[PDB]
Design a protein around this ligand. Sequence first.
Ligand SMILES: *[C@@H]1O[C@H](CO)[C@@H](O)[C@H](O)[C@H]1NC(C)=O
Ligand SMILES: *[C@@H]1O[C@H](CO)[C@@H](O)[C@H](O)[C@H]1NC(C)=O
Ligand SMILES: *[C@@H]1O[C@H](CO)[C@@H](O)[C@H](O)[C@H]1NC(C)=O
Ligand SMILES: *[C@@H]1O[C@H](CO)[C@@H](O)[C@H](O)[C@H]1NC(C)=O
Ligand SMILES: *[C@@H]1O[C@H](CO)[C@@H](O)[C@H](O)[C@H]1NC(C)=O
Length: 1518
Amino acid sequence: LSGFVRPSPIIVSSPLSTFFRSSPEDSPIIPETQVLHEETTIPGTDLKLSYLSSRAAGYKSVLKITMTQAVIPFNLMKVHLMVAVVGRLFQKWFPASPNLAYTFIWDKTDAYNQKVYGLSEAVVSVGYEYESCLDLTLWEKRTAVLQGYELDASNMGGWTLDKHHVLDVQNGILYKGNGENQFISQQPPVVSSIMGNGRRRSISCPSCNGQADGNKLLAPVALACGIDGSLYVGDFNYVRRIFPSGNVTSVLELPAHRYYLATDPVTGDLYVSDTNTRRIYRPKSLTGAKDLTKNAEVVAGTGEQCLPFDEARCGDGGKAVEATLMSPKGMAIDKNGLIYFVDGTMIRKVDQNGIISTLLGSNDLTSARPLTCDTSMHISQVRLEWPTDLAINPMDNSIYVLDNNVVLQITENRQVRIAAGRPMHCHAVQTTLESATAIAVSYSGVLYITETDEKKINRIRQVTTDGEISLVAGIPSECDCKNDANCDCYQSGDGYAKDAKLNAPSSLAASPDGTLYIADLGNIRIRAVSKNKPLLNSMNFYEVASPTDQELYIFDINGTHQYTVSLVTGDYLYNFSYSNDNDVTAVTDSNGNTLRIRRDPNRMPVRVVSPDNQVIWLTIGTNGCLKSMTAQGLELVLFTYHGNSGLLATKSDETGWTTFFDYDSEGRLTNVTFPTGVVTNLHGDMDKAITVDIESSSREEDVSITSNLSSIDSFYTMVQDQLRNSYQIGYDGSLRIFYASGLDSHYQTEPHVLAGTANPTVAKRNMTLPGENGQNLVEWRFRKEQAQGKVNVFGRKLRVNGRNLLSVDFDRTTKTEKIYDDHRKFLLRIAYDTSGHPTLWLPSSKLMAVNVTYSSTGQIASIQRGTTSEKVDYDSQGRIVSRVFADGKTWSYTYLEKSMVLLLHSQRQYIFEYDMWDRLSAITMPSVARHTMQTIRSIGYYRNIYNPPESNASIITDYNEEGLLLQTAFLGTSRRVLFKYRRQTRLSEILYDSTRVSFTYDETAGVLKTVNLQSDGFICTIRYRQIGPLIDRQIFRFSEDGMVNARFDYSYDNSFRVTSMQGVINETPLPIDLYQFDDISGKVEQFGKFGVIYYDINQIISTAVMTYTKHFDAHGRIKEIQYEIFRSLMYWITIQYDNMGRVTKREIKIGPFANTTKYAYEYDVDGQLQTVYLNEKIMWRYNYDLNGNLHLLNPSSSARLTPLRYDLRDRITRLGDVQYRLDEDGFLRQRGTEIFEYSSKGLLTRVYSKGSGWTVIYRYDGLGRRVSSKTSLGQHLQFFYADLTYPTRITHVYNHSSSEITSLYYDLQGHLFAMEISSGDEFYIASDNTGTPLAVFSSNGLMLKQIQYTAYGEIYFDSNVDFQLVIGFHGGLYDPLTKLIHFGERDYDILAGRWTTPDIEIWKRIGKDPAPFNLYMFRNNNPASKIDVNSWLVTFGFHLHNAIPGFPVPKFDLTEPSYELVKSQQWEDVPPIFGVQQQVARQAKAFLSLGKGAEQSWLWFATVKSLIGKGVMLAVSQ
Ligand SMILES: *[C@@H]1O[C@H](CO)[C@@H](O)[C@H](O)[C@H]1NC(C)=O
Ligand SMILES: *[C@@H]1O[C@H](CO)[C@@H](O)[C@H](O)[C@H]1NC(C)=O
Ligand SMILES: *[C@@H]1O[C@H](CO)[C@@H](O)[C@H](O)[C@H]1NC(C)=O
Ligand SMILES: *[C@@H]1O[C@H](CO)[C@@H](O)[C@H](O)[C@H]1NC(C)=O
Ligand SMILES: *[C@@H]1O[C@H](CO)[C@@H](O)[C@H](O)[C@H]1NC(C)=O
């Protein structure tokens, strides 16, 4: 019976529900499983709720069973498909057909109408039928996991509370409440040593029958499974029955020593393959007879050795007892009861009677054939080579025989197929195997091949039912265990099976609960690679942790949630009381925030009691599910469904954002309709990979998403028509990424030291640029100090590329902390509150002790850095009421009915309206200037409508549903900026009335290719070049006459540190830069030509002659900028601070031997510079109007009282004699004879003068930056920005009139200190705290220029007006002709004393924390001071932007970048679109985390009851 090939099933399962939004305020759609994830919020507490449609009843798991790729053989016509589930048994007959398929839609339901829960393994039985032998039918059975019903956490009508948790201790699933379903059983398995240690024991065996957990062993060479869980151990002379208890007895007394064992499933008897005595045994008393030798019933062989090779018999045909045998080997026994023993070199059969027969023998020299590498062959025409082991699959009644590293399976069709392994004659069938010394197979069909050459390979690679290999046990070791016998081959006891280091595994055995038993003779133990189980402590809890929130959870006996523990400090956070049916009813935070909740007699929540004593009422549906959350007055959120499916059909807010949802019968979200009109279309389909196709109906960005779900990883795929993103996700969480840019990061997993093996932790990040030196390696080292049951000192160290950076050694002795470095430079002791909050910061080396206590309602109470401090109070709602300071100042947050009135100490009222979510609705000044505000829902986009008082000139920012900006518009002059988006869901095309800035993205990589402004004959194109995502060459090409071209070249060294900069500007190359850094600490050793030495806070940016030191204060800020050239005193200022930190006394001794100059800053109670002293006289005053309007002042050099006047909108009208003109839409239109042209970006473009007759034009790029300034008088400049760490910090200035280039050098903070001209000149600048140039020196130390600045930094004293400087007051670009400081985005006026461009995003920054503000206020009217988070690494110098990538650089600058400029250095970390990007966002945020009302997607202002009402859909499909 041969020539009949085995069938080919094509089966797929459904993917699992482990993909949800990280910060759930952004994305509702995860098209992995098309599961809707929706957040909602309870008032008073940041605790949330969650929706997850995997909990829905209609979420039916799909098991797509297709049968053929139309290659049906000619003699096959019928298909008998059968499906075996938990008690549901489906059958359906088919006549055969090309590409005939079937979809089984499982109800997650037993046939006895039972809600199954947790994991389930349904068995698929694909059966075919031949035309040749109609009696013989095919059977190829597999398994397939299926998700059951998820366990009800809180019985919220299907909804899920956020920080609630429930543990499925039966199936091994942690159902989190945020949306995660941590599958404990799907993790990599746990090694647990269960018998003795590596020491030996002699032959006589004292203490031979008691308990065996530290019992010494002789040589365990064989193991065996059991239906009683009995582990029959072959300890070289003794068979020992390990009971399912502590006690372990002994049974029998006895290469050829290594006998093998067996176990009947249907009976409890024990079988011995004694090779030495040529017999098969069976004991009588397993508990123990008198003698251990005579407890052995012989089965076959009789000791006498049979014939070697003869085909007649060894005693065959007759009785099995009377026959003789030659060299028996390992064996098994059928579920029927047929024992099959290896003897000699062939398989020999014994039935229920004593009869030795043979199914497959050997010595068949008619078929001494090569190994049939493709198909099956005849039952008696197979040669065999060293079987030596046997195990049977009870699912298929298989026979797995280890034929020379190749397991050749034998099924009931009397055929021989390769199941695993490939010999020398020619997936697991693809690979070759070495030193296969034992086999086993579980009850799911998975094979287990141990491989031990005893030289760096002591491992077990499994083979599943498909024929694919996977390393599941045995780490590849480095130390040899043969030669180095004194090598600790035992490592990581109770670690991971991927991590555990074995030493010659001998035998395997598969218990029915999956606990695979490893016999290890090197370290003489019995390890058990079992399923992952949550631990049980001494108090019988479940200490399950997850450092995605840095938390430890503990559970009760049944596994429900009791406390929540912060994982590092071990201090308790939550208290969860229950009802009598163990359902959650109250929380209690460490500050007593008691979100209590009562239930129906049917255990259904109705009211919700908030910690700010607010009741929140709920309802129920006809399907027993929640419909609507209600608070006082307003119905907050409305939800309706699709009948009794439990699927969310409609989501309504309190506004009218009524989204609809559509589904199939299988529970797949195919259409999400947003009330702007933008819908999405999802083509769900199943193939070789599970494919979904999202179709945004406002774009052309159809994303194809396939899913290669393997038994190794879950290798997903994101495709946008050329760009392929694909992520490796391990079962532990080994998170490896294939971008299209060549960047291949790899996250690794480790067990937590406090938690155990039920917890994967990211500790090491591996990251791969496409290139040579693109190998970052940042690593943690977790370590505790254990003392008497509890953790005392938990330490951790961040390490990049080998060496220590930060020694975070937390202590629990007095709840202190010690963040430090090994070189004794850094020190920061942080004492903690008893409720788990950092209270007192104690740094050292002339620093200040910041102790910060906290409110009893939870929030902050008072910060105090020594003398500088402030105290606040609070209502019952946590609202701050008064804000007193340390200078006697005090603020009054005097609330009203849902509106706030800030009162200063000088009677200025800020009337703020609010929404229920506390957005900005209307803002009233101390005058009657009412800023009424809207947020509406239009066709395709939101509109944030701001309205100035008595104005139709509205500024309106338009947004998508993701929250990307679309359209800003100034409705005064009807100017507007359009954004067009291309395939990589990013900004492509700017458009404002003449100008087009076409971005484009690369096809293979996906980086920003071009930045190409086209406005006029002026062509402004910018092209890039990278190593992966990090730039190497940027190209500046122009096309007009005078303007020049530039191009820069970078270099990296074994990190993401920009090492050497070299560019060429107008065909003139520059000498290279040397940014010599310090990766021992994160410092900066040298840069350019300048050397930086630290003295414990201090800086000395010195050269061999030019020294620039700074002596910081006791408060962490700048205090004394001393500055000597040729080691002689040339410049030193000192600044002493008040109890507010503001600058008070400024003794600027500028000049070598000349007269000193000093100041004094008399502020007011409003906290602003009102009057300024010179050295011995008052010389300035500054009055202010009701709205912070500077309306009387002293000028630069004159002593007049120049009046100023203002209108409703705080638009400036007059400075003394000259009249200003700030127009209808906020742009500065006329200053005297000068009339401006602002652009639609809010950017100054052209300045022309009618009277004085001189024009200034500012050509800008597409990034909103300043490129070139051309005056009509002859000064013609052009800028170039060689920095990418600070992409607005300018570096090189081209001068058309002199054909010379000025290179720049800034300090560590950002202050200017040096200028080198590329025509061969050098300057040594010295700057103040504000960052502005005061003294200009040559290389000879001569004062070439001295400027005395006023309170707003316009010149009233100069030593030379010829040598001008572009960079002026507070580091911005100063122009002496147009009298305007150009910062990064806006333009400050030295004459007006305020801004010119009104901010739009100031309302986002003032809606959170209110303050004395204005639409044009400069530095909160504090024009000489710079700055609490109370501790920073940059203060003691650890500038870890260079060491650790993905970390935000401290932005100690005022020049803000543009919106399109932020998007440019954003390489591929977009706001996320798909759910696998939502998992890499957690493991990049929680890894980078070094320390210990809410909002929406840029919905700034208060909501409007718009035209699309609450309960109606508006849809636009392209
Ligand atoms: C919870 O555990 C208790 C004992 O620990 C047990 O009696 C009870 O049946 C379990 N289940 C529920 C739902 O209370
Ligand atoms: C989903 O949307 C597409 C296109 O609008 C439509 O053809 C399809 O019928 C919709 N499906 C459901 C279930 O509403
Ligand atoms: C990091 O990954 C690269 C390639 O992805 C590999 O060559 C290197 O050995 C890895 N290093 C570590 C420490 O994992
Ligand atoms: C802050 O520290 C000082 C001494 O360092 C102590 O007297 C004072 O009580 C502390 N205050 C708070 C609120 O911790
Ligand atoms: C540009 O060159 C002219 C030529 O005299 C000079 O006066 C001016 O100061 C230069 N400007 C800069 C910024 O170097």
